[PDB]
Paper text:
To improve the resolution of the cryo-EM structure of the [name]-[name] complex in order to accurately locate side chains of 9 Asn36 residues of [name] that consist of the upper constriction region of the [name]-[name] channel, the purified [name]-[name] complex was proteolytically digested with chymotrypsin to remove flexible regions of the [name]-[name] complex that may affect the stability of the complex in the detergent-containing buffers and increase particle heterogeneity on the grid. The resulted protein sample (denoted as the [name]-CsgF20–59 complex) contained a variant of [name] that includes residues 47–252 in complex with the most N-terminal 40 residues of the mature [name] (CsgF20–59), as confirmed by mass spectrometric analysis. In contrast to the oligomerization state exhibited on size exclusion chromatography, the [name]-CsgF20–59 complexes tended to form filaments with varied lengths on the cryo-EM grids. Using a similar cryo-EM structure determination approach we obtained 2 maps for the nonameric [name]-CsgF20–53 complex and the nonameric [name]-CsgF20–59 complex, with an overall resolution of 2.9 Å and 3.2 Å, respectively (S4C, S4D). As expected, the 2.9-Å cryo-EM map of the [name]-CsgF20–53 complex allows us to ascertain all the side chains of CsgF20–53 unambiguously—in particular side chains of the 9 Asn36 residues that consist of the upper constriction region of the [name]-[name] channel (right).
Residue numbers in the entry:
A (entry chain i), B (entry chain a), C (entry chain b), D (entry chain e), E (entry chain h): 20 to 53
F (entry chain H), G (entry chain F), H (entry chain E), I (entry chain D), J (entry chain B), K (entry chain C), ...: 47 to 252
Write the structure that this text describes.
Amino acid sequence: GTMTFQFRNPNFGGNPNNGAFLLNSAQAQNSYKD
Amino acid sequence: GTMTFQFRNPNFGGNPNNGAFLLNSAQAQNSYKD
Amino acid sequence: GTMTFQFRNPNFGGNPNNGAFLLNSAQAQNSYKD
Amino acid sequence: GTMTFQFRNPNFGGNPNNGAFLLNSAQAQNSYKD
Amino acid sequence: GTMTFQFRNPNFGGNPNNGAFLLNSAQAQNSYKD
Amino acid sequence: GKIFVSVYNIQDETGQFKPYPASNFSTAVPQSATAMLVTALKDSRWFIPLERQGLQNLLNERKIIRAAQENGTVAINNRIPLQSLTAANIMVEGSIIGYESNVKSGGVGARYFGIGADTQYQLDQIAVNLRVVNVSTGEILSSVNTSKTILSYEVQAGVFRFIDYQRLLEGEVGYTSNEPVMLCLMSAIETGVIFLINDGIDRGLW
Amino acid sequence: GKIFVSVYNIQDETGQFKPYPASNFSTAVPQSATAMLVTALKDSRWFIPLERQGLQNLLNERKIIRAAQENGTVAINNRIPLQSLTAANIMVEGSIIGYESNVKSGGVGARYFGIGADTQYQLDQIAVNLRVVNVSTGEILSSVNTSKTILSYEVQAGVFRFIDYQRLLEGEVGYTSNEPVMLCLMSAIETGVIFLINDGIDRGLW
Amino acid sequence: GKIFVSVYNIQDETGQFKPYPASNFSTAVPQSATAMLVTALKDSRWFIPLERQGLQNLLNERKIIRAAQENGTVAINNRIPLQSLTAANIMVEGSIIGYESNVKSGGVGARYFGIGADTQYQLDQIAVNLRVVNVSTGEILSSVNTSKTILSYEVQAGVFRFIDYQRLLEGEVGYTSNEPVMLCLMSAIETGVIFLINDGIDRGLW
Amino acid sequence: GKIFVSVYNIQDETGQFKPYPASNFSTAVPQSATAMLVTALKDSRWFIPLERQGLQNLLNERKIIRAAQENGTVAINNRIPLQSLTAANIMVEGSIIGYESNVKSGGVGARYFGIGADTQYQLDQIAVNLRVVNVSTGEILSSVNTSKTILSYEVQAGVFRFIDYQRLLEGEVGYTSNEPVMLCLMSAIETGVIFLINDGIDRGLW
Amino acid sequence: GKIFVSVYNIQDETGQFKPYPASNFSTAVPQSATAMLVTALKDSRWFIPLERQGLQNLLNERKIIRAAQENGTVAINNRIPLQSLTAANIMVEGSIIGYESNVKSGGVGARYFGIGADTQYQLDQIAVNLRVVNVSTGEILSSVNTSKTILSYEVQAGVFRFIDYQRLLEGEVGYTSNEPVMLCLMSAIETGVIFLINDGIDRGLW
Amino acid sequence: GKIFVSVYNIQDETGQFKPYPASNFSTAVPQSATAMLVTALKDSRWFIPLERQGLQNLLNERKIIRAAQENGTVAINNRIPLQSLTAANIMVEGSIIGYESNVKSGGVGARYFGIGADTQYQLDQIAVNLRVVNVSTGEILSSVNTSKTILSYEVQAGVFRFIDYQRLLEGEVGYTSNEPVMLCLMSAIETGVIFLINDGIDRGLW
Amino acid sequence: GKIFVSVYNIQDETGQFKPYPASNFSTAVPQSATAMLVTALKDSRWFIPLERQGLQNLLNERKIIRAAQENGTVAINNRIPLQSLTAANIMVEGSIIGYESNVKSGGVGARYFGIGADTQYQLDQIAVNLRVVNVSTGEILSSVNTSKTILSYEVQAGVFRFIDYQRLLEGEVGYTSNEPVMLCLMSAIETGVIFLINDGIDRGLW
Amino acid sequence: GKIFVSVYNIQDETGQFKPYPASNFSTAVPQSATAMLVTALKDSRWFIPLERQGLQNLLNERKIIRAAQENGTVAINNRIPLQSLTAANIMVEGSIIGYESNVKSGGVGARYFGIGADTQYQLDQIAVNLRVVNVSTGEILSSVNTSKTILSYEVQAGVFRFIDYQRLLEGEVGYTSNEPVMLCLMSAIETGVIFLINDGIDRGLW
Amino acid sequence: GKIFVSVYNIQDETGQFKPYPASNFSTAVPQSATAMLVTALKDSRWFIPLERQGLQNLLNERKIIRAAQENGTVAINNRIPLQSLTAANIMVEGSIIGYESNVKSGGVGARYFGIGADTQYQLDQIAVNLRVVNVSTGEILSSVNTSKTILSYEVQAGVFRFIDYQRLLEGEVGYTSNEPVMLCLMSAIETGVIFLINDGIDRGLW
């Protein structure tokens, strides 16, 4: 069928439910300190 | 009926509600430290 | 009426709201340590 | 009207919102220790 | 208009959103210890 | 003597349908007056209803009768003497002129520690207009508007307290009663027929 | 003498339906004027309504009468003398020209510690146009626009405070009252008929 | 002798459809009376039904028969003697005059520590009007309204307690029973036919 | 002398319906111009409207009159002299040419500690075109477009602060006012009629 | 000898459609009886079905045949001798008189620590009415109502426990089986045909 | 001299409706060109429009005039001399050829600590085609496509910061302005009429 | 010799549409049998199909041919000799008698620590009825019901475990395969044609 | 000399509507070709379009002209000489043969600490078929398919970082540009007309 | 010599519409074959298409030509010699026999620490049946079924990791490509035309 591009980030592109998981999975791998 | 491929991850493919459970179940098995 | 097979897990099969309860009920019975 | 059987548990039968309350009310009565 | 009986509890009768408040309001009055 | 009455159509002019969850095409009132009215007129010992609603079926059946026995060959026992379509001196027109959903709702629900109980009620209202028409002149001999309330109540009770330290007793008892709109429409039509009868009595007619 | 009046159709020209949760096809006003109006004209002691809405049923019934007694065989007691369709000198046209939902809503609700109570009200508005038409010339003898407000209010009260350390008393009392749109439409039609009567009186006619 | 009866159409004048999740076009009652009624009349040993619902198919088939053997060439064994369309002395009109969903719902559900169980029931109501019409005169010989309740119940039970420290045993047993609306409509039609039979017996006819 | 005017149809050419929650079939403007316009022309002391909208009802009623008194047997007092259908020299065509929802919305709401209050307003706009047509030649003698704004405002106020340590006082006062679209359409039609009158005066006509 | 039978239309008079998620226009029963019935009659060695459903196509094709060989120029090998449309002595009318969704649902699901398994079943019910009609007289020779249950079950099993400290093993095995409504409708039609055959045998006919 | 022009129909060939929340049947453009165009042609001092849209009403009214005064009995003052339907030498066909929603949206919103403010704008575009047609030959004398942008903007501002330790000041000021699509359609039609006028001037005509 | 066969219409009598997310008007089966069947008959070396579906286009084109060369002026090379519409001795009627969605679904999905994989399958079922009809007599020479399963499967695999302390590797591979319903309908039609051929062979015909 | 061309209808054969949030009835392409095409042919200096779309309006207006001046009484200056309907030698048929939504979407969005910015684009595609038909013979002289892409892009930027300890600066700048489908359809039609012109030039015609 | 071919209608017999979010009325395939096919036949150097789709427009235009020059007054240069409607020896019938959405979907997406990327693809399938029909006899000379896959893919990539302690870099690059269904339908029609050409060559014809 038709495929339409959508951004995965709620930042720049619309779907807001992704951001909660995105920030958590980016903090689950944030190996930086100080 | 018709079957359409959808990604399970909210990362790359759309359904955002899966990610909350996905990261938790990946952290429930994360046996790495340091 | 018509019955259609659906997976209960959000892992492999679509419904993501089940996973929050699934992981919690699997951790409520996780009797392993170390 | 028509009545259709549905499972109350999200485990085996579909409605996932019940599980959050089910596990909590089973833990509110869990009198086992050790 | 027409009135149809529905159970208030998610236990035995369908509406799952009631259970979160029900267990909390039963624990807000749980005067038992030990 | 009993009065022949011709009920052609008691149309559902209320324009109402049922709200969600009901279907969008599910009317609030049965489309089956002219059968509740014909039954109300028959069951009152004053009238003999004539078909008039299903008159085309009657005319096709009379065509079939007339063509079955026009050749004079039908067995003389099972031939059907068609006399002529009996005619009515009066004619009962009418409609379901209105259905109001929840003209009066209400409810009281108390809940002490654990044990609670509530009551709810809704009153719909259905109005039926019935006109006795003079077939000779066309004048409307009488016209009545009968209203009927449709009570729908609901009583629930429930327990959700703790009996022991970690022992939770839940319980629920519910009851609901929707007054059938067909029963209330039949009641409004019967009251309207009683009024038409007493009116035709109280001035000359009947 | 009473004036014969011919009401053919009082159409629901409001174009309005009911909002959600009601069905999409559920009109805001009954489609049953011409029965509220015929009843308003009959119940006012000035007019004799003639059928005209259901005139095809009357003409089919007169066909049946005429064909039942044209052979001169009908029993001379139960034969129906058809005179001729009585005609009206005036004719009441009209419509439901408008239904406005919530021309004025409002509500006040207070709530101190636990105990609270609110009131709500909505005013709809229904307007009906009635025209007395001169059948001889076609000229519109009179035309009135009558408006009627439809009040729908709702009063609730409730308690949700604690009575003891771990004892919660909940309570709720509710009442709702929707003025029937059929009753308000009947009231607007009756006021319009009163106005038409007094106007026909106040200039020559009647 | 058995009475020939002509059932043309038993229309579903209830106007009801099924609520969500059902389709908006899915009627609450089968559109298949006149087949339940023809079967009820045939299975009662009093009547011989004549087709009348599918009469155009019968007339086209009789056209085909008549054109197949008008040339006198058809083999004299497989030629079909058309006699004439057998006619009925009475005619059973009728309708499904009303379907009420949940005239009486209810349910009781208890739940002690873990183990719980509930019951639910709904009563719909279906009403059928049946009229025996005199085809000679058109007069409605008899008219009955038969009501039938449609019970739909549901029993569930379940366990969700802990058996050991960290061992959770969940379990569920459910049963549901919806009385078929076609079976209840057939029951109402059969009761109405029994009433029509006993009425025609109890006054002169039959 | 008063000018006979024939208003046939003032069509709702706006094409607009109401937004959610309203029904999809609920038009934004009443379909009941030609009754607001006939009333505006009658209530202005310049015109005599002729029916023309309901002319088929008038012609059927004149058929009934003509057939009731053609045999010369009607009682000479209650016979109706049909003269001829009075004709108009001008004809008012027109439409509701447009309805714009929220041409100007706005609102200001402040809220200090606990106590808050807001105001909201929406302006719809309805435009009506009215054409005076010369029936002799067909030429459009005059054409005006009248616009009218429909103000709908809403004022709310509320308190949600704490009065004591653990004492919460909530309170709310609300008011809403939707200007009826039928009233604003009547106002636009009346202004258009005033303009047509003054134009016909200001050049030759009238 | 085999009996010629004319099946014109076995209409889907159930009025049912499928519930969500299915489309609103997706009927619950195939609209394709009269093809299951014609096949049931052909496959029973008692009947020869005649087309009658697609008779207009047959008549247009016979027009084409008749116009292709009326000039006597067609090659004498590939000319088609039209004899005449073979006619039936009986005619099988009928309908799908009802489809009930979930006349009996149920299910049992257990789940110990991690490992769980459930079963579900739904029984729909489809009823078919078949009438053997006597084409000579129009009388309904026989009428049967055959019901058939449609079982739809579903078995699932699953594991969601931990195998090691931080090692989670999830697993799921599912199976579903919906009995085709076309297969169950064919079974009901075949049983109805068997009943019609044995009935026509058991009294005179056949 | 002024040119007679016959505008029959300026159809809304855009095919567009309004998006949610608006109704699905609520068109994006008024269906009321041919009234904006007739007004644009009348208000330009070059043309005399003839009715042609409502010509059947004019012809019925001329039938009524002609039948009212054919007997020579009408009072010689209030008889209406029908001359003949004035004809046009040119004819303005046309359409609303397109409506684009949000050809250019945009917005800038800043927000420092607490205090914030945003602006939004949307440009729709409506295009109208107007054709001057030569009625003698049928040739299209001229054809113009006029576009017009419809600006809809919105400015909001708000405060949500804390003024004291536990004192929160919220505030909001909003304004919205949707350019009426009927006003922009009238502007496009007026520009198209100006272009048609100047074109007919600039080559021979007019 | 090859047998001329006339396929008029193979109607989609399944009544099914597709479930959500598909459109409500999107049928479950192509409406394009009579083209799959005509192709199946042509591609089998036994039949010559004649148009019959598009026969009105053929008759209009033959009208055009006949009117182009009736004056004898057409160039003798490019004139088209119309012979006569070739006629068929047999005629293949039929339908898609049923489409069942998910007659057998299923799936197995395992997932160890991180790495998981599942499979899913659904079987739809499509049934086609094909009737060879004798055009001379109208008798149904043969009738077959062919069923075909439509397999739709789906295999997915995925990784969501941690590779290092704070390094998460996610991965997913998916594949889906829906058997085209047009391909399965063509397969069912081809099998039905093979059966009709072998049946006509095995008894006299062909 | 300029070629007379008759454009009757350029139908929107794309079958496409707009996706959500747009209305379900809002087509993806304007229904207003035959006005973009007539304008493209007129604005190219090669053709004179004849009305043919609005030919019934032209024929009614010519009836009015013909009946206004048949009595020879019209003032000899303002009488309209009807010559005859000018005919075209060629005829431009055509359609909008396809609209594809998002044949190529895409987007790139970056976001460093606080400051971010994205771009998005969608390409729709609209194809128009134009056929020059020879009216003498009916042969299609030429047929071209012109495609045109419709670019819709969107650029946003935003800041959401902290400027001080507890001072948050939010900011957003957005721009969107949807290429009008009416402009792209006009461009495709103009390119198709250029191609038809150059083709008619390059082989004999024109 | 080139063969005249008459394409009347290539109907979209697929019955499919587009799934959500698309409109419910938005078909999956263009309704604009018979224009892609006429173009495919014209662009192949073997055929001359004749209009036949728009034949009523051609016949009305020929009526206009014939009535413009029947009086012999038209200027002898710009008179149009109507010869006769050129006729076709063959006729191409056909349909879009099926559209399957997602006959094969799939996708692979990996994601290491922060950086991830996925690919997705869907294959639709469109099948077109083309029949060359012999207009002299009506026999279907040839019939081909051509299938074409419609690939729609999508590639995305993204970064969401941290670059510094409290510095988050997000980034996204996306691309999508939907193969136009009109382009794939044109490709299937062109392949079908190539097959029809080579078949007519390979056996006698052409």
